[PDB]
Amino acid sequence: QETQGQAAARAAAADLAAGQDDEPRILEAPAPDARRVYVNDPAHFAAVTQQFVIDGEAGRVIGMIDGGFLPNPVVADDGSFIAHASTVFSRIARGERTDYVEVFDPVTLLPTADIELPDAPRFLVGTYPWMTSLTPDGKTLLFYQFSPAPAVGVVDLEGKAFKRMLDVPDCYHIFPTAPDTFFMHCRDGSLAKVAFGTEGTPEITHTEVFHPEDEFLINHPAYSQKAGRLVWPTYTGKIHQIDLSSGDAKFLPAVEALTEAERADGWRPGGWQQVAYHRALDRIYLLVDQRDEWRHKTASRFVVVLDAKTGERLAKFEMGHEIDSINVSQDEKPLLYALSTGDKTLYIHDAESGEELRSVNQLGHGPQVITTADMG
Amino acid sequence: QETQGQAAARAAAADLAAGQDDEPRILEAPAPDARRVYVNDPAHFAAVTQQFVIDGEAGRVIGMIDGGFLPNPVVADDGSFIAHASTVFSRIARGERTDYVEVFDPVTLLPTADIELPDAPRFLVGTYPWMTSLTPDGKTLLFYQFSPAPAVGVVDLEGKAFKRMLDVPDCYHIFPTAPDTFFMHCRDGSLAKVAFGTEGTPEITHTEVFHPEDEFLINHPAYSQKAGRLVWPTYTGKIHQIDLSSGDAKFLPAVEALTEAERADGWRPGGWQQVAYHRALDRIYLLVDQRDEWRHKTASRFVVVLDAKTGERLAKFEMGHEIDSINVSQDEKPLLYALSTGDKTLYIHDAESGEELRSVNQLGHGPQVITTADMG
Amino acid sequence: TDPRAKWVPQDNDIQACDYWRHCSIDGNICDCSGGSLTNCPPGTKLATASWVASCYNPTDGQSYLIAYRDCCGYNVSGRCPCLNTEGELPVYRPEFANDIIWCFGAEDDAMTYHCTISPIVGKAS
Amino acid sequence: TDPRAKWVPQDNDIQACDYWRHCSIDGNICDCSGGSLTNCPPGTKLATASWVASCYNPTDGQSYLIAYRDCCGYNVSGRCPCLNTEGELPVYRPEFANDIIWCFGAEDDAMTYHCTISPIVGKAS
Amino acid sequence: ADDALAALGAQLFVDPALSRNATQSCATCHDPARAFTDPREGKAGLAVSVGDDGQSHGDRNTPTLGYAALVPAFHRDANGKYKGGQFWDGRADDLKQQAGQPMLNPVEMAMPDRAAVAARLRDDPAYRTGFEALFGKGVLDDPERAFDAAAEALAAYQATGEFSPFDSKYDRVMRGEEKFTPLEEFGYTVFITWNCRLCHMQRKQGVAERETFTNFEYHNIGLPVNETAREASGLGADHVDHGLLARPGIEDPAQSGRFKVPSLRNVAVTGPYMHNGVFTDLRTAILFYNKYTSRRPEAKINPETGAPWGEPEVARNLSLAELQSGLMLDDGRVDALVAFLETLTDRRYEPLLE
Amino acid sequence: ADDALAALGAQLFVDPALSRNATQSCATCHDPARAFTDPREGKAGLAVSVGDDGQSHGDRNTPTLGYAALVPAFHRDANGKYKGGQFWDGRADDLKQQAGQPMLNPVEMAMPDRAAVAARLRDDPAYRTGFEALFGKGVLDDPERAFDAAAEALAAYQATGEFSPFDSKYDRVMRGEEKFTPLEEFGYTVFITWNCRLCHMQRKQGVAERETFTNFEYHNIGLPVNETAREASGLGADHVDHGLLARPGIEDPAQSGRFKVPSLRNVAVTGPYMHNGVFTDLRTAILFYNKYTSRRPEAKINPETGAPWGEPEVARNLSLAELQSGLMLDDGRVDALVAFLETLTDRRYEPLLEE
Numbered sequence A, B: 001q002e003t004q005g006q007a008a009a010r011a012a013a014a015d016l017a018a019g020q021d022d023e024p025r026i027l028e029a030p031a032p033d034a035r036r037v038y039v040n041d042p043a044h045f046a047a048v049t050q051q052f053v054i055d056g057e058a059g060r061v062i063g064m065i066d067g068g069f070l071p072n073p074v075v076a077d078d079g080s081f082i083a084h085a086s087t088v089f090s091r092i093a094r095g096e097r098t099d100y101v102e103v104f105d106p107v108t109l110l111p112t113a114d115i116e117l118p119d120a121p122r123f124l125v126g127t128y129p130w131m132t133s134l135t136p137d138g139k140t141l142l143f144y145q146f147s148p149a150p151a152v153g154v155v156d157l158e159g160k161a162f163k164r165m166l167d168v169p170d171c172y173h174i175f176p177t178a179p180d181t182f183f184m185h186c187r188d189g190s191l192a193k194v195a196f197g198t199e200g201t202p203e204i205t206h207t208e209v210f211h212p213e214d215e216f217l218i219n220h221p222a223y224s225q226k227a228g229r230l231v232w233p234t235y236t237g238k239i240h241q242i243d244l245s246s247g248d249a250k251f252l253p254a255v256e257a258l259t260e261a262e263r264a265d266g267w268r269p270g271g272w273q274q275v276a277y278h279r280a281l282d283r284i285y286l287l288v289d290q291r292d293e294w295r296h297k298t299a300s301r302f303v304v305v306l307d308a309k310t311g312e313r314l315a316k317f318e319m320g321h322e323i324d325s326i327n328v329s330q331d332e333k334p335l336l337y338a339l340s341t342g343d344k345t346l347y348i349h350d351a352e353s354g355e356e357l358r359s360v361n362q363l364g365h366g367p368q369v370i371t372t373a374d375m376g
Numbered sequence C, D: 001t002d003p004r005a006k007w008v009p010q011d012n013d014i015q016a017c018d019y020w021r022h023c024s025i026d027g028n029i030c031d032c033s034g035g036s037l038t039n040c041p042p043g044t045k046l047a048t049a050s051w052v053a054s055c056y057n058p059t060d061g062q063s064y065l066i067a068y069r070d071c072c073g074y075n076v077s078g079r080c081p082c083l084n085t086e087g088e089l090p091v092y093r094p095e096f097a098n099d100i101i102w103c104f105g106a107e108d109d110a111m112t113y114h115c116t117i118s119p120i121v122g123k124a125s
Numbered sequence E: 001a002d003d004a005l006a007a008l009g010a011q012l013f014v015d016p017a018l019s020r021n022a023t024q025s026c027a028t029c030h031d032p033a034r035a036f037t038d039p040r041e042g043k044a045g046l047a048v049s050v051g052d053d054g055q056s057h058g059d060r061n062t063p064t065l066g067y068a069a070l071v072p073a074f075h076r077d078a079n080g081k082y083k084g085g086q087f088w089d090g091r092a093d094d095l096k097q098q099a100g101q102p103m104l105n106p107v108e109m110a111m112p113d114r115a116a117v118a119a120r121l122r123d124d125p126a127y128r129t130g131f132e133a134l135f136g137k138g139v140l141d142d143p144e145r146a147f148d149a150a151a152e153a154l155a156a157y158q159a160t161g162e163f164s165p166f167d168s169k170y171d172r173v174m175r176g177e178e179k180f181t182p183l184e185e186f187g188y189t190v191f192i193t194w195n196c197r198l199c200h201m202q203r204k205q206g207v208a209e210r211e212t213f214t215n216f217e218y219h220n221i222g223l224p225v226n227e228t229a230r231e232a233s234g235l236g237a238d239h240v241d242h243g244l245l246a247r248p249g250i251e252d253p254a255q256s257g258r259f260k261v262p263s264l265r266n267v268a269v270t271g272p273y274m275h276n277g278v279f280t281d282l283r284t285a286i287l288f289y290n291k292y293t294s295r296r297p298e299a300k301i302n303p304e305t306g307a308p309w310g311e312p313e314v315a316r317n318l319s320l321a322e323l324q325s326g327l328m329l330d331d332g333r334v335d336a337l338v339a340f341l342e343t344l345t346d347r348r349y350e351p352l353l354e
Numbered sequence F: 001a002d003d004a005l006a007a008l009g010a011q012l013f014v015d016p017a018l019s020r021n022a023t024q025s026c027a028t029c030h031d032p033a034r035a036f037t038d039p040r041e042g043k044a045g046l047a048v049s050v051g052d053d054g055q056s057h058g059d060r061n062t063p064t065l066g067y068a069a070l071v072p073a074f075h076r077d078a079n080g081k082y083k084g085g086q087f088w089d090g091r092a093d094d095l096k097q098q099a100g101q102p103m104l105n106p107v108e109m110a111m112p113d114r115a116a117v118a119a120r121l122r123d124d125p126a127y128r129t130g131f132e133a134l135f136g137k138g139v140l141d142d143p144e145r146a147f148d149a150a151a152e153a154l155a156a157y158q159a160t161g162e163f164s165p166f167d168s169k170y171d172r173v174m175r176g177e178e179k180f181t182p183l184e185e186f187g188y189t190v191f192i193t194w195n196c197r198l199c200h201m202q203r204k205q206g207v208a209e210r211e212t213f214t215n216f217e218y219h220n221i222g223l224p225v226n227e228t229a230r231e232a233s234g235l236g237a238d239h240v241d242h243g244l245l246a247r248p249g250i251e252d253p254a255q256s257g258r259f260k261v262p263s264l265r266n267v268a269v270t271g272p273y274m275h276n277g278v279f280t281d282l283r284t285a286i287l288f289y290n291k292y293t294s295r296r297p298e299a300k301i302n303p304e305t306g307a308p309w310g311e312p313e314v315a316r317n318l319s320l321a322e323l324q325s326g327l328m329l330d331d332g333r334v335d336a337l338v339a340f341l342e343t344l345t346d347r348r349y350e351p352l353l354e355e
């Protein structure tokens, strides 16, 4: 019940009363852990943006990172670094464009690499986590390019250098499975496997088509790189699961997040980051509400929870706020993170009971993306 | 009583029914006129900021200009151009600083000049209009530098080049009176006249001291360059007037904006741009409210209007909103502009009756500064 | 106001998020920053790329194709923000996707998003 | 809550704008962006310049001189904004003036404003 | 009588007596079986047509006459863009001023003068009847009146429902009479969202009453010379086709190399393409536009030759603002555009589509 | 006994019999009429002091002993900052370890060894009584016990209120007994908002019980050699004064050129200034700091010489983070700082302020 700002007043008065000296200095953030959570604020397309680093357990902002125009955040699963691909202009939003990758130390938040990306190659879009992606060794960053055509840029983080663009087919998103391989989703309804060497055209294999042309897959699937599990809901809440753990795509039985009855009652997923996946529990969390079929980007007030293995519903939580995005911590007794763009606030819930524990407000102008590390 | 969005729907619908074609293109703003008003948004110290160009007569945004960190706006009195002095960084708010001046065409809003200021010489301060100032001929921009010591930078707008820094005494603010002369206010309570050239020590002459060390003169005096009239309120609403029209300072009789009874009951000016001056009517407008003496930057809800020659009160307007800044158009039947930082809204009032006529909302994050041209 | 409710178009105010031509707009209405319903504000750059939606006009009962175009090269206007998604598809169907910054073809290679205009380019079908 | 009312210090919560040491703060409290009452957040640069005010402590009835210092080099935090001006004087008395970005002496020549810390440097006189 | 006038033009249009040696009529080069273009193979394939003398070839591809009646008379609009007229370079004001030109052109029908045309008209009893009923007795005795009346009849005939029937699949779909296939509907969506709609749609915005998929403007899209056609034309390897700048009275250097945007109706059956017939296949015409947008090495290569496209004939005034769109058409979008453009084929030409 | 020990040190402090030729006592170089500093002119003016031989000059300026008792014993704090100790280079741990050293230094009191000092103490019947009363019978017969006991007495004497009275105008104003002038007040405001507060205040934050206007740390502020002093000391043109690095046991080259921050109490009457006495005027000591901040040509020039300040004697480990403040002190603020520092003068030395 005592707040962080109250306990801080009391510590400060006791220092004063006892004559305890201390040097004003730059703090270090605490060590990355399972309960650290990152909230990116794309700020409704503003030319400059912010990321908040938050301790989920205390509900406290522990630092911030500035970015430019629609940056893509990535966070190494082992906690060793964070990075983003970003874009700046010589006169605010006009003049010469520079795209670049920065790597930051995760406790000092100091840039440890600034890597310029030649010829302004980033895709400028509303933030999708899997349009920029780390390989599982953490040594390579892969970013998507849309113009003039779908391509994928390879950035060597170890040597701090852009390497090359890979030509790909008409495909979207980047799910890395190895130091030299990633998967994308193609317009035609298949996945493409892209295997790449230091030089050469890549080797590209497609799977079979796994969804029909009139089944719409959302912009924000959940991908657990450590499980090799791609969890991909459609506009109706049908959930495709693809196992990438063998290094090849194996398509799991499709699951329905909503019942036939709820569907006919106008229950649909909706929001921004609509789906989360917990690796250890093998569990899928989906933001849903009653809504018209073309209100798919509005906030939702419920989360449904289901067993990934069977598709049985485990819980349905009333969130108590307008929630746009969700994610979960990857430890035992996880937190369920529920971000409201409209409230600019991160609501922090027990993922088991769905109860709200605490919240962090004043998170920028239109915060939308939550990222966690999977450290287990 | 039909709104602008309503008029526009009506017109679009008649074009559609009539089969009228038009080519999508970039608009020109309407020609600068007496009722154009500019609102700058320092955005509570954000690294990037905006200025809104408004037609006060329609209450319509007719354009915007982007700026960097706490830019200083100037508007040429004859409507020929606008300009700002501004500051950007190579990585949003960190890395190499570049200070520059840009001049813009007042109808296309394109930069017609971008002039680098060497050695990052601008004073970064919450926005004070008379910290960056045009000479009466429009040929030279003067900007204040605080660090390492008070100095004034001279920018040749015609030649599009930085000229020199001038060393000055311990003084502040810049009120230009001639192509080669301006006045500043000194810590010691005098003004300093500074006459300069391209090279050599400028000629600096102090006036007599005109106020005690414990009368505090606000950071936002009104200066009418065409009248040579410097109107300078103190924290208590006592108003100093200095006539610079001879080329030398002449001290006019001080007037009290508030009566002895109002002052006894806690009335004081307060806000950001607390004072305005209408040249053709010789009238002074002051934002006032009942307030504790150290709440001198809070909004006020009243404006007093007084005759600048006699100090007689002409009106006291109840603004009906929390107003931080005021200014007036310089034409006959002028408008009284009332800007609310908290509502992010410019309220446009008839200056004669004080009645709110219309308003323009959604003006950025923390708009504070109103500038108009004296074209008459 | 019920955000999850079926969107209801009107044809009487272009500055409101329910104006019929804004059925798949994402960002800001240009008329609120000095442009007009089908023109860019001064200082900005008009893109040639577009997104499309079929928007029902309640006035004449017809459906028109609105091919949205962005006005680019300025920070986002911050005035009259709107996000509607009638017929909006995911990014892999990009001709119908509205999270994408459609500043391609803008003069000076302007690519920052200021606001969006709503011109009719055809009848639907 | 009445913004024009006399400011009333408290010594129970440093995140509030009425916390006694914030009597002439202008900006944001660093405690709310990962700093603490008297330390900068990670990634920012601590200025050596300051501004002073004499702030009454309601815990011990004494006035203390608070020499504010800015943490610089990041865009404004936007969390716990506050503007108080007890004893605050115009810019020509800069040691008491709080509109100035007091980032001088920050490492790497950082000059953008992020938040302000509130350390005590003496008793009043 | 508007009916009568057009019926007279229908007679003239297929009459080889309007050529010097009576070997060709309008319909020889504008074959009604081929959407009013030229099926005949000459020294440069179907790129350019052979005149009445059996040897002379033109330097430009024979365009369709379908929908040519929807084009406004030549003018400069308020934005300073030239619009309308007839011929690839706009050198004729309208269809009437156009009609007399092939008759007297030595590389086409090759009549020596208006007097020779009149003499041929006056030699036909039916023309004496039909002309005199419409223009007055003695019209055919006056070479100038006769030639002007023949041009008026031909222009009237070209303005009938038969040249512009608006019965394509696209037309049926817009009337709500059927639907596009998925591939056609994709191609239409690409056409109206990519750069094609900036030049190949009548209006900038709104819906056209009788769309012909051209804005009637003049653009230099940077086409290379058609080598074998330039050779066949005999104009010399030194010659430059300046497009609109060659119109008498146009003097503005910015119009050099610009040509009239063609209507895309019947495009699928009126190959080869462009003003010089340089591309034989519709897909190649579409791929040409990737040369301005794609970074793939294949975009530099003409798939019909496997060699680089070739330098533009006229290297200035390219429509770069419109052409450098920032987006490359992938193979699937090219397929969709072809399928869409095939829906602009008039009902009576659908059998040609195989 | 606390009393008697300090009383014994009071006698020693003024006794020239602790010097080889008997010409010199502590109080000769630490003159209580001059805030415990040396008024005598030698070959380098007042920059360095002459020893008991009448010829040898030291290489460092004689500091005040006023407030030296508030300095903590030498230690490395947790920041890795050395702090405290005695002498400009902290080579003595505390007052007691320091006191024996001038006695045996051949450029100062020049006694040949501890036994010789014991033999001088033993000659004086008053020392036999006072020493034995405090330290036991036979103390003066054991050279090592006698020497350590004298150092003890002398350190006790410097710990009395006489050396640290806290009765300056500044102290009175802090007790509410009087007020600063507007100029003194402006000088205090500058001192506490500019970089001076970063080294010349006891604490990093909070309020000190007994402020002496030093943090007891070691800093290289980039001072030049004082050439006439260095010529007088005879150490050689090639000698470098390494400051803290010269302390036995410090080996860290980052400590080279660092000296202990002096207390500013009585600074107005204890010129010349710095560890080598290089600046005559207090104004000039203040102006030196503008070399790191000002862009004016004048800021590079020592106003006492008309010549540049000079190349630092040690041109590495400069405290640039603190020195490069970004703000130049204009003349009004130098004026104010002089005024303020003059309020740090002990009551009994206020009459010295005029001269």
Ligand code: HEC
Pocket: E013, E024, E025, E026, E027, E028, E029, E030, E049, E050, E051, E052, E058, E060, E061, E062, E063, E064, E065, E068, E085, E086, E087, E088, E089, E095, E098, E099, E100, E102, E103, E107, E108, E109, E154
């Ligand atoms: C020898 C082949 C030939 C004959 C015979 C011929 N033309 Fe053509 N026609 C052409 C060529 C080639 C062009 C384009 C020439 C150019 O643009 O310079 C053309 C262009 C036209 C155009 C303009 C179409 C457009 O889109 O710009 C019209 C109309 C036209 N012809 C009508 C006629 C009429 C009527 C006749 C009979 C009097 C006729 N033509 C005889 C080959 C022929």
Ligand code: HEC
Pocket: E194, E195, E196, E197, E198, E199, E200, E218, E219, E220, E221, E223, E258, E259, E260, E261, E262, E263, E264, E267, E270, E272, E273, E274, E275, E276, E282, E285, E286, E289, E319, E322, E323, E337
């Ligand atoms: C800059 C205006 C412009 C743009 C954009 C444009 N075109 Fe064209 N198009 C032309 C002009 C002009 C010609 C004739 C060029 C010439 O022959 O000199 C032409 C010719 C064609 C032809 C040959 C038709 C014929 O009868 O010979 C086809 C097919 C075509 N365009 C399709 C497209 C498609 C599909 C797109 C979008 C990928 C497109 N164009 C973009 C102006 C444009």
Ligand code: HEC
Pocket: F013, F024, F025, F026, F027, F028, F029, F030, F049, F050, F051, F052, F058, F060, F061, F062, F063, F064, F065, F068, F085, F086, F087, F088, F089, F095, F098, F099, F100, F102, F103, F107, F108, F109, F154
């Ligand atoms: C010849 C002049 C001379 C005499 C006599 C002298 N000293 Fe000093 N004293 C100095 C000089 C010079 C220094 C600084 C030397 C250095 O830093 O290496 C100094 C430094 C000190 C310090 C260090 C103060 C500080 O702030 O670091 C103390 C304590 C001290 N002396 C006490 C004494 C006592 C007690 C005596 C008599 C036993 C004495 N001195 C005799 C010249 C003298």
Ligand code: HEC
Pocket: F194, F195, F196, F197, F198, F199, F200, F218, F219, F220, F221, F223, F259, F260, F261, F262, F263, F264, F267, F270, F272, F273, F274, F275, F276, F282, F285, F286, F289, F319, F322, F323, F337
């Ligand atoms: C980086 C730490 C630091 C800063 C900042 C600093 N000082 Fe000093 N000051 C010192 C040190 C160390 C010395 C002794 C230097 C030496 O002799 O080698 C010194 C010496 C002095 C002296 C000579 C005292 C004596 O007894 O010789 C005066 C006066 C002085 N400082 C005043 C100031 C003023 C006023 C400011 C603010 C403009 C200031 N200082 C800033 C560390 C600092």
Ligand SMILES: [Ca+2]
Pocket: E037, E061, E062, E063, E270, E271, E272, E273, E274, E277
């Ligand atoms: Ca053709």
Ligand SMILES: [Ca+2]
Pocket: F037, F061, F062, F063, F270, F271, F272, F273, F274
């Ligand atoms: Ca001294």
